[PDB]
């Protein structure tokens, strides 16, 4: 039996890719985040940038070519 792991950052591309693989045929979302002072130096009102990045699993315990999509089989 065969293992499929298919991953991508853009929800639209990922959903498309699962939609166009079943044209042939718990691992939830987690997010990569940072907070960081907006200015270069340290002068002025202390405002902050909050950067964020979610990326998804889709699990295919098997019994289109999209650039930015990642696949491993193991």
């Amino acid at each position: 039996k065969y293992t499929i792991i298919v991953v991508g950052k853009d929800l639209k591309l990922v959903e498309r890719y699962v939609k166009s693989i079943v044209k042939e045929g718990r691992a939830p979302v987690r997010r990569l985040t940072i907070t960081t002072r907006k200015s270069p130096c340290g002068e002025g009102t202390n405002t902050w940038h909050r950067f964020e990045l979610r990326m998804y699993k889709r699990t295919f315990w098997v019994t289109v070519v999209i650039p930015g999509i990642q696949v491993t089989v193991e």
Partner: peptide
Amino acid sequence: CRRCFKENAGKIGFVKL
């Protein structure tokens, strides 16, 4: 670094919501 992060995080992937 945080300074370098701002002008290149945009496409490494970090976005603002």
